[PDB]
Design a protein around this ligand. Structure first.
Ligand code: SF4
Lengths: 296, 269, 464, 96, 232, 231
C-alpha cells in the first residue's frame, strides 16, 4: 500500500478497530468505543444562546497538536505521529486560544506501534505556545465551494503521511455566513462532498463540527442530521431548576450542573441496526480541568 | 419463539415465476425510521433472490458469497460511496462479479453535477442504469436507496419532473424495482410539513400510489427496551399485482424484530 | 351493601428488634425518638387519621365511634365494617392492653358495656352492624403459636407480614431483625390456621441493581415458598428524617430515574399469578417532605400504556373484578364458566375456584380451599383427623344481571351455594377428609350457620 | 430438580453442548466421536371411555411416581403412590 | 318523474352509459385507491355491449391495462399534442351522427391549472365521455403562480367541482379496529396500519340536473360480485 | 465594584445606562407605542448629570422630538447613502459605557432582511450605542423570506432576537372592565375599545450576561411619576 502516520490510536475494545480519542473525559467514554473510531464524524448541539460547546471545539484540536508536538525529541519512542489540523472560520482568534497541557500522561494502558492516548488538560492554562502554519491552517468559508473542495484534496494529497483532523467552529453562524449560502443546495452539497472526501480516505481522516439549532428551521436540520454519523445534544437547565438546585445545594459548589445530555446517533453500532437513542439520562458540566459528563 | 418470514400466498418471499413472466412490472416500497437502518432486510432480499432463501434470518450465513451465480443483482445508492459499498458489503459478503454496485457520492458532487444543465444530468444518471443492465436482461433485481435526496441537489426541482425522468423509465425498462427511503419529514414534533414543505411528501405519496407492496420498519413507542428493537409492517401497495396467476395475493401480518450483531429475530406479541 | 374500612391507632411504643441492632430499620420514618415524638413509627403524624387520633389521645372507642358517625352522616349507611390497625408492632404491648383494646372495639358497635372478652364476642355475634374481620400487623418474631392462639381468639382474619427482600445482606444492612428463611416457616404455620397472608416489597434499596430487583420478584412468584395471597409494592422514597437521607447526605446513595422505574413496574405487572391481588402500586406518601425519588401518583396509569405497547396485560384480581352489583353491567356479559386451579404452596396442596368469563377475563366469585398437612398443624381441632379449611369465600356474584339466563327474581341469591357444594364435593371425594371448617369474622357467623356448619372454638365446622 | 436421565459409558474425554440446537451434546469414547439427541415427551395411559382415567407417570432417580387425574388433581411437586426401583429408570410405559 | 325510480337503477344507467354524461369526476385518496371503479365501468358497460375504443391516457402508470383497448403514454407530449393525438382514436367533433367511446385518465394531479378549462373545451363533444380520478392528498405546486396580493384566481378543487355534471367520492369502509381519527393521524405521520385498501368500499353520489338542484346519496359497493346497496 | 444588583436597582442601572451594549432592541405594537419609553430613558439617564448626545433615525416619526440633538430623515434616501450619513454624526471610538453619541431608531420594519446584518455590522461601533424599535403585530412583507425550497433563511423577529444584546418589550394595562381576549377580538375586527395607549404599562426585560445566559424580568411601570415596582 502507501505510507501512513497515525498520530495516536488504540484498538477499539468494543469491536477491535482503530480508535482515536477526542481528549475529553466522559464524552469519549459515552461514544461506545471508549473513543472515536477512525472515519466516523460526530456532532454536538446546544439548545440555548450559551457557548458551552465552544470549549469542546478547542480541546479536540489542541489534543492533536500536543500529540504532534510531544514527539519531536520529547518522546523517546519517536513514534510517527503527524497531524495537519484545518480550521474553517472567518475569525482567527483560535490561533492564540489553545489551552495548556496540565501534566501530560499520554499512557493508554490501564506503520508503527501507537501507545498514545488522552492527556490531562486544564482550561485556565494557555498552550505553550502554538503551532505554525506548517502544522495548522485556516481557510475562510465564504469562498466558492469549488476552490475549497479542490484545496482540501490538494492539502491531504500533498501531505499523505499526516493524519487528518478537521474542525468546523460554529457552522452556520449568521454573523459570517450570508443568506446566499443558506440556500438548500449549497451547504448540503458541500457536506455531501466533504463526506465523500472523508470516507474516501477512511484510514485516518476525522472531522468534527457543531452548529446552533435554535435559529435553524427543522427541515434543514433534518436534511443535515443524515450527513453525519453521530449526534449529541446538550440542553441547559431552565432558570427555575438552577435556583432550586442552588437553594438545595448549600454544601457543594462542585455539585452544581448546567444541563442534560441526549444521545441521538452513535458510530458503526447504529449501521448494523441498533436502537441507540437515549435522552434525559446524563448531565453535563464545564469544569476547571475538563468537560464532565455524569449521570443525573 | 421464532417465526417464519412469509410474504405471499405461495408461502414464498420472492416467487421465481415472477422472473419467468414476460411483459410485466412490479414495484416495492420500503420505509424506515432513520433511527434504524434496513440493511439487514436488503441483505435478506438479495440472498433470497439469488440463493432462494433468507440466508441470514431463517437460514445460516456461512456460505454467503453469491458471486458468479446464474442469477444477478444490481444495487445503486447516493447515501454512501463506492469505497463503503465494496469494503462493507464485501465484509457483509454481498456478491461482486454476478453483481453491480453503483455509487453517486464519491467525486460525483465536485463539478460533475454542479454548474451543469439539469437535462444532461438526468439523462446521464438514467443512461448509467440503462447501459449497466443490458448485459443480463431478465434475471436481475435492482434496488435504489433514498433517491429523493437528489431533489435537494438539483437547483429547483419538483416531484413530477424527477419522477417522470428517473423512476418510471427505470421500472419500464427493468422487470422489478425496489425503492427504499426514510420518513423523518413526517416526524418533526410540533411542526407541520404541510405548511410549505409538501414537495418531498408528494414523492412519498406518489411512490405509495405506484407501489405494489409496502414494507415498514418503525421504532418502538414511547420508551426504549432491551429485548426488542422495532416493529415490522407489511401492507398492500397502491398498484395491483401484474402477475399472470389468479390465486396470488399478499399475506397481512405484523412482526416484532430484534437486531444484534447482524443477527435478527422476529416474533409475535 | 355498605362495606366500611375504619382505621384505628395504637399508643406509641418501640419495637424491640431495635434492641439487638441499635436503631429502627433505615427506611422507617419518624417515631417516638424522632422530632415528632407523639406518633407511632412509619407515620409522620400528619395524616388525617393521625389528627383524629391525637385529638382523642389515642383511644380506640372515640376514634371508632367518631369515624363511624361521620361516615353515616356524610350520606352512606353502614352495616358492614372491617377494622384495620396501624403503627409499629401491636403485639409487643403488655397483656391487658390488647384485651381492653379489642373489647372496646367490639363494644363500640355491639353496644355492650361489659368485660370478660368471651362474653363481649358472644354478644357481638348476635348484633347488628356486623363486623367482617380485623387486620393486624405483626412481625415474624411475634407469630409464635401462643400469639396465633391470641389472634384467633380476638377475631382477626388476615395478617400482613413484610419481607422487603429475599437477599441475605439486605436483612442485616437494613437493621431488620430476622433471617429471610424464617419467614417461610412463619407462612407455613400461619396458613394451616386459615389466615390469609399478605406481604410487602420495595423495588429500590441500597446496593441493589435493576437485575437483582427483577429476579427477586421472579423467584418470589415462582418458588413454592413465596406464594402468598396478596402483595404491596412500595417504591423507595427518601424522607428527610429517615436514615435514608443520611446516606444521600454523605453521598452513599443514589436513586433510579423515571424511565427505569416505569420499565421495572411494567415488567413486574406482566408476571402476576391470577390468584394474587396487587393492592397498591400507586401508594400514598407524604408528598412535600420527600427529597429523592420520583412522583408516584400515576405509575400504573403509564404502566398500562406500556403493557398496551408490549402486550400481556395484567391478570390480577383487582383489574378483573366486576363487583357486588352494577359496576360494569352497562353491557351484558358473555359466556360464564367455572375455572379451577391447583397449586402447591408452603407444604400443602391448595385449590382456587372461580366463576369467570373466559373470552374477556372478568371475575364474579372465588373460593379458596386448603388440605391440611401433618407437619404444621397443632390445633386440637385439626390434630384429630384429616380436615380441610375454606380460607376465604368471596362472592361478588351478588350481581342482579348476568349472561346465560340469570335468575329472574332470584338474582343469584343461590349463587354462593353452587361454590359451597362444589367445595364439599372435592372435600368428600379428593381430600378424603372427615371434617371441613371455615374461618370468618364473628359478625357473619350466621351466613354459614344455615348450611349446617356448627360452632367449635373459633371455627365453623361440619363432619362428613 | 428431577433426575431425568442417565447415560452409561466406560470412558470420557470432554463434553460440549450445541450453540444453536439444544439437547444434542458431544462426548468421546477412546477416540470415537459420539452424538446424542433428546426431546420432550409426556407419558400417558389410555384415553378411551371404557378406561378413561388420566394417569400421569413421572421418574425421579430410582423412584417412579404416579398421579391418576380426574381422581386427584395432585400438583407437580408432590406426588402419589410411589415405588422405589433397585436401579435408575430410563423409560416407563403403562397398560390398558 | 317516471324515470329512474330507484337510485340503483340511476347508478347502473350512469355506469353503463345508457344516459350520456358530458363530464364525470371521481375523488379518491391514499386510504383507498381508485382503479376498482374502472373495473366497474368495464364490467357494467359491457352488458349493454360497449366494446368501443376504451382509450387509457396515462401520465404516471407503468403497466399497460388489460381491460382497456388502447394505451397512450403522455410523459413526452405537450398540451396541444396531447389534444391532437387523442381526437383520432376518439370520435372527434365531426360526423354529427356517430358513436361514442370511453376515455380513462389515470391521474389529474400532474396538470397545471392554467390549462384545465381548455382541456375540457377543445375536446368536449357529444361523442366523448371523460373519466378521470383526483387524488386529494397531493397539494399542487404553487411557486410558479406566485399567489401574491395581485396575482389571484380560484384553486383547482373548485373548478373541478364546478365544471362537473356528476361527482362520485370514494372511501374505504372501516372493518376492524381502526377509526377515522387514529387512521388520519397515522397517515399524517405515515405508519400505514393494517385495515386499509380493500375491495369492499363506499361511495357518495352527487348527480346534477338541468334547471334544478342536484341529488346526493350514499352507496356501498363490492368489487367481487359487482353488486350495490344503497345507504339505509 | 457593584455586583449582584438589586433587581429594581438593576432595572434602573440599565435604564440609567450605567451598563451599555452596541445594540438594544425594544418592541411595540398598536396597543402601546414606545414614546413614554424614550421619556423614561431620558428621565433616568440625564438625571445622573449627563447630556447623552442623541442622533435620530426616523422611518415612522413625523416631527423632530425634544430628545435628539441632530437630525436625519431616511424615508427619501436609501441604504447606500445611510451607510455614509450614519458615520457623519457618529465618531468611531471606544467606551459605549459612558457619555457618547446614542443612535436611536423609531422603526425597523422597513429594511430588507437580506441586508439587516450588512447594516448592523457597520453601525455598532465601540463609541456607538444603538437602540432600535420593532412593531410586533405588523406582518413582515412576503418578499423578505422567499417561501420557496431554496431560502432557509429565518424570519425578521428571530434574527433580531438572536442578534440584540438586550431585549425590552412593553404592553398596555387595560384599566377598564374588559379582557384582553375581547381586545384581541375587536382588534381582529379593527375596533378600538376605550382604554388603549395608557401611561401605566407593563414591561418585559431580558439581558444576555455571564458568557451567554439570560434571566427574564417583569415589573410594573408608571410613566408619570416614573415609578418602577415589582409585579
Ligand atoms: S419494624 Fe416497623 S415499626 Fe419497627 S423500625 Fe421497622 S418499620 Fe418501623
Amino acid at each position: 500500500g502507501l505510507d501512513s502516520s497515525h498520530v495516536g490510536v488504540r484498538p477499539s475494545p468494543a469491536t477491535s478497530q482503530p480508535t482515536t480519542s477526542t481528549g475529553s473525559a466522559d464524552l469519549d467514554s459515552i461514544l461506545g468505543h471508549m473513543g472515536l473510531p477512525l472515519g466516523n464524524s460526530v456532532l454536538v448541539e446546544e439548545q440555548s444562546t450559551t457557548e458551552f460547546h465552544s470549549i469542546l471545539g478547542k480541546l479536540f484540536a489542541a489534543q492533536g497538536i500536543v500529540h504532534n508536538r510531544i514527539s519531536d525529541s520529547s518522546a523517546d519512542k519517536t513514534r510517527n505521529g503527524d497531524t495537519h489540523v484545518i480550521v474553517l472560520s472567518l475569525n482567527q482568534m483560535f490561533a492564540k486560544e489553545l489551552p495548556g497541557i496540565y501534566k501530560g500522561s499520554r499512557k493508554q494502558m490501564k506503520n508503527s506501534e501507537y501507545k498514545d492516548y488522552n492527556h490531562q488538560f486544564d482550561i485556565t492554562t494557555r498552550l505553550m505556545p502554538a503551532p505554525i502554519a506548517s502544522e495548522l491552517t485556516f481557510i475562510a468559508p465564504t469562498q466558492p465551494v469549488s476552490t475549497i473542495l479542490s484545496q482540501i484534496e490538494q492539502t491531504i494529497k500533498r501531505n499523505d503521511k499526516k493524519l487528518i483532523r478537521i474542525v468546523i467552529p460554529s457552522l452556520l453562524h449568521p454573523a459570517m455566513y450570508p443568506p446566499k449560502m443558506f440556500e438548500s443546495s449549497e451547504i448540503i452539497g458541500l457536506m455531501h462532498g466533504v463526506r465523500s472526501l472523508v470516507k474516501k480516505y477512511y484510514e485516518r481522516v476525522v472531522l468534527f463540527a457543531s452548529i446552533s439549532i435554535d435559529i435553524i428551521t427543522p427541515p434543514l436540520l433534518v436534511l443535515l442530521r443524515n450527513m453525519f454519523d453521530s449526534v449529541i445534544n446538550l440542553e441547559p437547565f431552565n432558570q427555575e431548576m438552577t435556583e432550586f438546585l442552588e437553594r438545595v445545594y448549600k454544601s457543594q459548589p462542585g455539585k452544581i450542573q448546567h444541563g442534560l445530555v441526549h444521545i441521538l446517533k452513535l458510530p458503526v453500532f447504529t449501521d448494523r441496526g441498533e436502537m441507540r437513542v437515549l435522552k434525559s439520562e446524563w448531565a453535563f458540566k464545564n469544569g476547571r480541568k475538563k468537560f464532565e459528563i455524569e449521570q443525573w | 419463539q421464532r417465526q417464519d418470514l412469509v410474504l405471499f400466498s405461495d408461502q414464498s418471499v420472492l416467487p421465481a415465476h415472477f422472473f419467468q413472466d414476460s411483459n410485466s412490472h412490479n414495484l416495492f416500497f420500503i420505509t424506515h425510521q432513520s433511527c434504524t437502518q434496513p440493511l439487514w432486510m436488503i441483505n435478506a432480499l438479495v440472498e433470497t433472490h439469488v440463493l432462494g432463501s433468507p440466508s441470514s434470518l431463517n437460514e445460516s450465513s456461512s456460505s454467503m458469497l453469491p458471486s458468479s451465480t446464474r442469477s444477478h443483482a444490481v444495487l445503486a445508492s447516493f447515501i454512501h460511496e463506492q469505497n463503503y459499498f465494496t469494503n462493507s458489503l464485501n465484509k457483509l459478503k454481498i456478491p461482486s462479479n454476478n453483481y453491480n454496485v453503483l455509487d453517486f457520492l464519491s467525486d460525483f458532487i465536485v463539478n460533475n453535477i454542479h454548474n451543469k444543465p439539469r437535462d444532461k444530468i438526468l439523462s446521464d444518471v438514467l443512461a448509467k442504469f440503462s447501459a449497466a443492465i443490458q448485459n443480463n436482461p431478465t434475471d436481475t433485481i435492482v434496488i435504489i436507496e433514498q433517491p429523493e435526496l437528489l431533489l435537494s441537489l438539483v437547483s429547483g426541482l419538483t416531484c413530477s419532473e424527477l419522477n417522470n425522468k428517473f423512476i418510471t423509465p427505470l421500472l419500464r425498462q427493468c422487470k422489478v424495482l425496489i425503492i427504499v427511503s426514510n420518513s423523518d419529514i413526517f416526524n418533526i414534533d410540533e411542526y407541520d410539513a404541510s405548511v410549505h414543505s409538501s414537495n418531498l411528501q408528494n414523492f412519498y405519496k406518489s411512490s405509495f400510489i405506484k407501489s405494489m407492496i409496502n414494507l415498514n420498519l418503525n421504532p418502538l413507542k414511547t420508551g426504549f427496551a432491551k429485548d426488542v428493537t422495532g416493529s415490522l409492517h407489511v401492507c398492500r401497495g397502491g398498484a395491483p399485482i401484474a402477475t399472470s396467476n389468479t390465486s396470488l395475493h399478499v399475506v397481512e401480518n405484523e412482526y416484532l424484530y430484534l437486531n444484534e450483531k447482524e443477527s435478527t429475530k422476529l416474533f409475535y406479541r | 351493601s355498605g362495606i366500611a374500612v375504619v382505621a384505628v391507632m395504637c399508643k406509641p411504643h418501640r419495637c424491640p428488634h431495635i434492641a439487638y441492632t441499635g436503631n429502627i430499620c433505615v427506611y422507617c420514618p419518624g417515631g417516638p425518638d424522632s422530632d415528632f415524638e407523639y406518633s407511632t413509627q412509619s407515620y409522620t403524624g400528619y395524616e388525617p387519621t393521625s389528627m383524629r387520633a391525637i385529638r382523642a389521645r389515642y383511644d380506640p372507642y372515640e376514634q371508632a365511634r367518631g369515624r363511624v358517625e361521620q361516615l353515616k352522616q356524610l350520606g352512606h349507611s353502614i352495616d358492614k365494617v372491617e377494622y384495620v390497625l396501624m403503627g409499629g408492632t401491636f403485639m409487643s404491648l403488655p397483656k391487658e392492653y390488647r384485651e381492653d383494646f379489642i373489647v372496646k372495639l367490639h363494644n363500640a358497635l355491639s353496644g355492650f358495656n361489659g368485660n370478660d372478652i368471651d362474653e363481649a364476642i358472644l354478644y357481638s355475634q348476635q348484633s347488628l352492624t356486623k363486623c367482617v374481620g380485623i387486620t393486624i400487623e405483626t412481625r415474624p418474631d411475634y407469630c409464635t403459636q401462643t400469639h396465633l392462639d391470641d389472634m384467633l381468639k380476638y377475631g382477626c382474619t388476615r395478617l400482613e407480614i413484610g419481607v422487603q427482600s429475599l437477599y441475605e445482606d439486605v436483612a442485616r444492612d437494613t437493621n431488620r431483625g430476622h433471617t429471610v428463611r424464617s419467614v417461610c416457616e412463619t407462612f407455613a404455620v400461619s396458613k394451616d390456621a386459615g389466615y390469609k397472608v399478605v406481604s410487602h416489597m420495595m423495588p429500590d434499596l441500597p446496593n441493589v441493581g435493576m437485575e437483582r430487583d427483577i429476579e427477586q420478584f421472579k423467584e418470589y412468584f415462582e418458588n413454592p415458598d413465596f406464594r402468598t395471597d396478596g402483595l404491596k409494592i412500595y417504591p423507595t422514597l427518601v424522607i428527610r428524617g429517615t436514615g435514608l437521607y443520611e446516606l444521600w447526605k454523605t453521598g452513599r446513595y443514589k436513586s433510579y430515574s423515571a424511565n427505569a422505574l416505569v420499565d421495572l413496574v411494567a415488567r413486574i405487572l406482566a408476571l402476576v399469578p391470577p390468584w394474587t391481588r396487587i393492592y397498591r402500586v400507586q401508594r400514598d406518601i407524604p408528598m412535600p417532605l420527600v427529597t429523592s425519588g420520583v412522583d408516584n401518583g400515576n405509575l400504573r396509569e403509564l404502566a398500562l400504556a406500556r403493557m398496551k405497547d408490549l402486550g400481556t396485560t395484567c391478570r390480577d384480581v383487582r383489574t378483573r373484578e366486576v363487583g357486588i352489583q352494577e359496576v360494569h353491567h352497562k353491557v351484558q356479559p358473555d359466556q360464564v364458566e367455572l375455572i379451577r386451579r391447583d397449586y402447591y404452596a408452603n407444604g400443602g396442596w391448595e385449590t382456587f375456584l372461580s366463576y369467570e368469563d373466559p373470552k374477556k377475563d372478568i371475575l364474579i366469585g372465588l373460593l379458596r380451599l386448603r388440605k391440611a398437612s401433618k407437619k404444621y398443624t397443632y390445633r386440637k381441632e385439626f390434630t384429630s383427623q384429616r380436615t380441610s379449611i375454606v380460607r376465604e369465600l368471596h362472592v361478588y356474584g351478588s350481581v342482579v344481571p348476568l349472561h346465560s339466563r340469570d335468575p329472574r327474581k332470584f338474582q343469584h341469591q343461590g349463587f354462593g351455594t353452587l361454590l359451597m357444594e362444589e367445595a364439599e364435593r372435592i372435600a368428600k371425594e379428593e381430600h378424603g377428609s372427615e371434617k371441613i371448617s371455615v374461618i370468618s369474622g364473628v359478625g357473619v357467623r350466621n351466613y354459614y350457620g344455615k348450611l349446617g356448619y356448627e360452632l367449635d372454638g373459633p371455627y365453623m365446622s361440619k363432619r362428613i | 430438580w428431577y433426575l431425568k436421565q442417565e447415560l452409561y459409558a466406560s470412558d470420557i474425554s470432554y463434553v460440549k453442548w450445541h450453540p444453536e440446537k439444544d439437547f444434542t451434546l458431544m462426548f468421546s469414547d477412546a477416540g470415537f466421536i459420539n452424538i446424542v439427541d433428546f426431546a420432550y415427551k409426556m407419558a400417558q395411559g389410555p384415553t378411551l371411555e371404557p378406561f378413561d382415567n388420566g394417569t400421569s407417570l413421572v421418574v425421579d432417580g430410582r423412584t417412579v411416581n404416579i398421579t391418576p387425574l380426574a381422581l386427584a388433581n395432585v400438583p407437580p411437586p408432590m406426588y402419589y403412590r410411589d415405588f422405589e426401583t433397585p436401579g435408575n429408570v430410563l423409560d416407563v410405559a403403562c397398560s390398558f | 318523474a317516471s324515470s329512474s325510480h330507484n337510485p340503483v337503477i340511476l347508478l347502473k344507467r350512469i355506469l353503463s352509459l345508457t344516459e350520456s354524461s358530458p363530464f364525470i369526476l371521481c375523488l379518491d385518496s391514499i386510504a383507498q385507491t381508485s382503479y376498482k371503479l374502472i373495473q366497474e365501468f368495464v364490467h357494467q358497460s359491457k352488458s349493454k355491449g360497449n366494446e368501443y375504443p376504451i382509450v387509457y391516457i396515462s401520465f404516471e402508470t407503468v403497466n399497460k391495462p388489460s381491460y382497456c383497448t388502447q394505451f397512450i403514454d403522455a410523459t413526452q407530449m405537450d398540451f396541444v399534442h396531447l389534444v391532437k393525438q387523442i381526437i383520432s382514436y376518439l370520435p372527434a367533433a365531426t360526423a354529427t351522427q356517430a358513436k361514442k367511446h370511453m376515455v380513462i385518465i389515470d391521474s389529474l394531479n400532474y396538470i397545471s391549472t392554467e390549462y384545465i378549462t381548455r382541456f375540457l373545451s377543445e375536446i368536449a363533444s357529444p361523442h366523448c365521455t371523460m373519466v378521470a380520478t383526483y387524488h386529494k392528498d397531493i397539494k399542487d405546486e404553487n411557486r410558479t403562480v406566485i399567489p401574491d396580493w395581485n396575482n389571484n384566481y380560484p384553486d383547482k378543487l373548485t373548478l373541478l367541482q364546478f365544471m362537473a355534471t356528476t361527482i362520485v367520492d370514494i372511501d374505504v369502509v372501516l372493518t376492524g379496529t381502526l377509526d377515522t381519527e387514529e387512521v388520519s393521524e397515522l397517515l399524517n405521520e405515515f405508519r400505514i396500519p393494517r385495515g386499509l385498501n380493500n375491495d369492499i368500499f363506499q361511495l357518495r353520489l352527487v348527480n346534477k340536473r338541468k334547471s334544478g338542484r342536484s341529488l346526493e346519496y350514499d352507496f356501498i359497493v363490492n368489487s367481487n360480485t359487482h353488486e350495490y346497496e344503497l345507504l339505509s
